[PDB]
Design a protein around this ligand. Structure first.
Ligand SMILES: Nc1ccn([C@H]2C[C@H](O)[C@@H](COP(=O)(O)OP(=O)(O)OP(=O)(O)O)O2)c(=O)n1
Ligand SMILES: [Ca+2]
Ligand SMILES: [Ca+2]
Ligand SMILES: [Ca+2]
Ligand SMILES: [Ca+2]
Ligand SMILES: [Ca+2]
Length: 885
DNA sequence: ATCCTCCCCTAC
DNA sequence: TAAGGTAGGGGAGGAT
């Protein structure tokens, strides 16, 4: 269809109507016409009112700025001289320095006392000039009055849009009210957007509502999900230069609605009717594309979603329209003449990997590619639409041929395309993608768009700037300087390896690293030193503390740190999510709620990580190292306290043994053969141990393993009990059977062997199954699908890896192949070459009847993991004999 | 025969 | 702030 937004009130007028809208995105821009507070640059916020009206609100009069410390010079307070310095800067920086305001601030770096210092807040008429100013102060030669020649630390480096959001109290996905009489309409001939309401307000006059109570609701966002089909060549993934887009299916709904209010398919050529959806068929591809752009503009979606839309559908359409010279195509943002462009960049982090990105500006609309969401929030063996639809939704080549048939074959194609457009919307709603990300944007204060495009650091940065503003504190700008060394981390306890046929109680600290930062008041602002404690005559333990890393931090007596408060808020949110999880029946919903609480846990742990990131801009290893140091002492103290308490000479039946533990957990063999008693002792022990640490540190009994197969550090399995009557699952940590680089032959067999032993207590049956499997490998009875190994392609290599060698080979053969950051699928083929030269594309293998290295799969894939699980039961000799041959 | 490094992924 | 942290198994090969 294409229904448009509800019409505005007929008597609408800025003097009559407040405008309250949920802002979903914002960007820096220059406003045509009069300046405000000597600047023509604005932050344009886009969003939606409770009645479903779209809004572009220009926030005017907000000048970017930087802080530098006032010079240590007698003439520093002479206004005439400050005025002259401003003239000097205007001569140097394109006449873009507005003024200098003298303010009292303190650096976030350390405790020197509560005495604040004079800083110079230097305002600019356009935001980007702050960067050049910062550079000049840092490495330029601003030699006026010998004030900064030369040179100086600068403070509060942050992008202009976020600077405004922080200073105005605006978080992501938040509500803003524009009071009647306080804003003005953009005149018809000056309009730049297609929003129903295009207005301007001075930043001081907007009301930024905290996302709480009556202002924690969300606006009725219009969600558009789409999917395209292309008719491409046999053997070639479609290329925009040659292969037509032949269908675009669309579904549009209101956030949270039961059903979409628009369902349609744009087709090239004719297409027979589809019950419950509109069909818009076109004689030419060009027409279809232009109509689709017009459709977006008229429907005015707030969020554009789909599955792989980011890396495929969107760039493909842009590139296709360009190839076809449909030159007005790429204008479907909310800014009428702002072109959608592909920005090529690179994203890299340990958590998310390293890869090229192709982000497109669709100004004033959000994007939520469900493939990108699911990849971030879930660990799955496969992320194909089919795979994830079957997994989350319970769902169960010819394309070009269907296209070249008739109205009926194209209809068939259109149902497929419509379904592919609908699934992402089902996924978004069931996985609560929009709802949970709204929460995250609000809690951390970042724009929604940062969640999928950016990392954990920017969320920490936003929270830090917001807390610092509250206490007149500013943050020094430092250059990233990656270290060649990692600081010392956690203790992993030496395992007493083997098969335990008695209950093992697992105890672990709630939110360990955050609880350590809170208990011990660990923050940039509380960091001190020997020199200060003496100049100030502070008393150990009352006024400060010395960490096991040897660092001095002041106590809450002297200063409440800010990191503890940020962590407190994140843990509160997490606790709300956990309660929701505790209160929910449906297994699937609980799953989703489990990701929500995990996401918030990672956010809290990322505040610790931020302090340890030298690949980052505010490392403080005093904090990160003190945290890990405390952690090592705590697990040692926990192990010692459990062993000293629960022993025969204290009236217990057995001497408790800590058989294993990792970072913040201990696995305890109390000695009893009874499961409930082990769980009761585990609970009592955690309660006792918790009394030995400072609030809010807390040890809890987590679960019992019975039996428990401990193979090595970070390698074990066990039946996992949270009640003594029925076990929850067969839990596996670290084993090949839970690593996504195992071939499924190994994972499946390991899984079945573990089940037969731990659940069915049938070692004989497990061994018969392994022997059968060995026979199948050696007689080529294993489907190639179970032999495929997948590994991520790294950006660069020192040592040649089989999948990386194969990726280059594939490009040589086909002109294209896996890119950095893609998983590469391969099987090992037979032959005399080095292993890294013997990884091959499974399709290439099938096509050419190439023999797979069967013995390799036996000896170098199956054999070691299987021996490691059965040897503890049948012994090393038998386990090894089973593999001859 | 030991111990190291690069690599990939997972345990925290 | 472009990009949260460290420990460590085990495959595969390198240096003494
Ligand atoms: N992604 C992660 C996971 C863990 N850790 C560190 C900090 C954690 O506090 C500690 C223990 O890991 P847990 O998985 O037990 O995490 P928590 O104790 O924080 O959370 P929970 O309350 O779920 O046990 O390891 C981390 O820095 N980053
Ligand atoms: Ca698709
Ligand atoms: Ca726990
Ligand atoms: Ca924990
Ligand atoms: Ca743990
Ligand atoms: Ca090692």
């Amino acid at each position: 269809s294409s229904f448009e937004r509800k019409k505005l009130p007929t008597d609408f007028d800025p003097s009559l109507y407040d405008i309250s809208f949920q802002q979903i995105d914002a960007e820096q821009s220059v406003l045509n016409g009069i300046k405000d507070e000597n600047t023509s640059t604005v932050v344009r916020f886009f969003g939606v009112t409770s009645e479903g009206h779209s809004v572009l609100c220009n926030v005017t009069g907000f000048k970017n700025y930087l802080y530098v410390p006032a010079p240590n010079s007698s003439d520093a307070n002479d206004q005439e001289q400050i005025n002259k310095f401003v003239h000097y800067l205007n001569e140097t920086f394109d006449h873009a320095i507005d003024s200098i305001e003298v303010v009292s601030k303190q650096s976030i770096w350390g405790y020197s006392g509560d005495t604040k210092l004079p800083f110079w807040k230097i305002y600019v008429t356009y935001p980007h000039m702050v960067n050049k100013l910062r550079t000049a102060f840092e490495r330029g030669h601003l030699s006026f009055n010998s004030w900064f020649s030369n040179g100086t630390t600068t403070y509060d480096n942050i992008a202009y849009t976020l600077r405004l959001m922080v200073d105005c109290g605006i978080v992501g996905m938040s509500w803003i009210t524009l009071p009647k009489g306080k804003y003005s309409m953009i005149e018809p001939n000056n309009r730049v957007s297609s929003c129903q309401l295009e207005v301007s307000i001075n930043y001081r006059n907007l009301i930024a509502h905290p996302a709480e109570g009556d202002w924690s609701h969300t606006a009725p966002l219009r969600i558009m999900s789409f999917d395209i089909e292309c008719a491409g060549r046999i053997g070639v993934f479609p290329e925009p230069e040659y292969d037509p887009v032949i269908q675009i299916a669309n579904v549009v709904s209101i956030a949270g609605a039961k059903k979409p209010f628009i369902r349609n398919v744009f087709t090239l050529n004719t297409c027979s009717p589809i019950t419950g959806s509109m069909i818009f068929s076109h004689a030419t591809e060009e027409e279809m594309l232009s109509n689709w752009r017009n459709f977006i503009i008229k429907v005015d979606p707030d969020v554009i979603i789909g599955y792989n839309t980011t890396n495929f559908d969107i760039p493909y359409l842009l590139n296709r329209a360009k190839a076809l010279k449909v030159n007005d195509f790429p204008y479907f943002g909310r800014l009428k003449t702002v072109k959608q462009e592909i920005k090529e960049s690179v994203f890299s982090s340990k958590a998310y990997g390293t890869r090229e990105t192709k982000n497109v500006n669709i100004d004033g609309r959000l994007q939520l590619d469900l493939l990108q969401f699911i990849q971030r929030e879930y660990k799955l063996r496969s992320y194909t639409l089919n795979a994830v639809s079957a997994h989350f939704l319970g769902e169960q080549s010819i394309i070009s041929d269907l296209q070249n048939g008739d109205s009926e074959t194209r209809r068939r194609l259109a149902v497929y395309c419509l379904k592919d457009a609908y699934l992402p919307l089902r996924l978004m709603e069931k996985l609560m993608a929009l709802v949970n990300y709204t929460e995250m944007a609000r809690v951390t204060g970042v724009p929604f768009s940062y969640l999928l495009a950016r990392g954990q650091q920017i969320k920490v940065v936003s929270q830090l700037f917001r807390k610092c503003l509250e206490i007149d504190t500013v943050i020094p700008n430092m250059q990233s300087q990656a270290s060649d060394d990692q600081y010392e981390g956690a203790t992993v306890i030496e395992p007493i390896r083997g098969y335990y046929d008695v209950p093992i109680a697992t105890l672990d600290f709630n939110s360990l690293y955050p609880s350590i930062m809170m208990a011990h008041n660990l923050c940039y602002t509380t960091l001190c030193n020997k020199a200060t404690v003496e100049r100030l005559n502070l008393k150990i333990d009352e006024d400060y503390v010395i960490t096991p890393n040897g660092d001095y931090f002041v106590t809450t007596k002297r200063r409440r740190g800010i990191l503890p408060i940020i962590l407190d808020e994140l843990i509160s949110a997490r606790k709300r999510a956990k309660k929701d999880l505790r209160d929910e029946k449906d297994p699937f919903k609980r799953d989703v709620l489990n990701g929500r609480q995990l996401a918030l846990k990672i956010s809290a742990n990322s505040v610790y990580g931020f302090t340890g990131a030298t690949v980052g801009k505010l490392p403080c290893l005093a904090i990160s190292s003190s945290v890990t140091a405390y952690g090592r002492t705590m697990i040692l103290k926990t192990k010692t306290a459990v062993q000293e308490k629960y022993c025969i000479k204290n009236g217990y039946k057995h001497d408790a043994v800590v058989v294993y533990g990792d970072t913040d957990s201990v696995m305890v063999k109390f000695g009893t053969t009874d499961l409930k008693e082990a769980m009761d002792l585990g609970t009592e022990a955690a309660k006792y141990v918790s009394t030995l640490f400072k609030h809010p540190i807390n040890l809890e009994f987590e679960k019992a393993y019975f039996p428990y197969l401990l193979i090595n550090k970070k390698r074990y399995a066990g039946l996992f009990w949270t009640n003594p009557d029925k076990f929850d699952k067969l839990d596996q940590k670290g084993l090949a059977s839970v690593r996504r680089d195992s071939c499924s032959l190994v994972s499946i067999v390991m899984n079945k062997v573990l089940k037969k032993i731990l659940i069915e207590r049938n070692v004989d049956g497990a061994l018969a199954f392994v022997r059968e499997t060995i026979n199948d490998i050696l007689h080529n009875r294993v489907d190639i699908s179970k032999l495929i190994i997948s590994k991520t392609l790294a950006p660069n290599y020192t040592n040649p890896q089989p999948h990386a060698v194969l990726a280059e080979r594939m490009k040589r053969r086909e002109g294209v192949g896996p890119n950095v950051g893609d998983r590469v699928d391969y099987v090992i083929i037979g032959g005399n070459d080095k292993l890294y030269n013997r990884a091959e594309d499974p399709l290439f293998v099938l096509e050419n009847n190439i023999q797979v290295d069967s013995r390799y799969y036996l000896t170098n894939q199956l054999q070691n993991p299987i021996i490691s699980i059965v040897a503890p039961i049948i012994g090393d000799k038998q386990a090894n004999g089973m593999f001859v041959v």
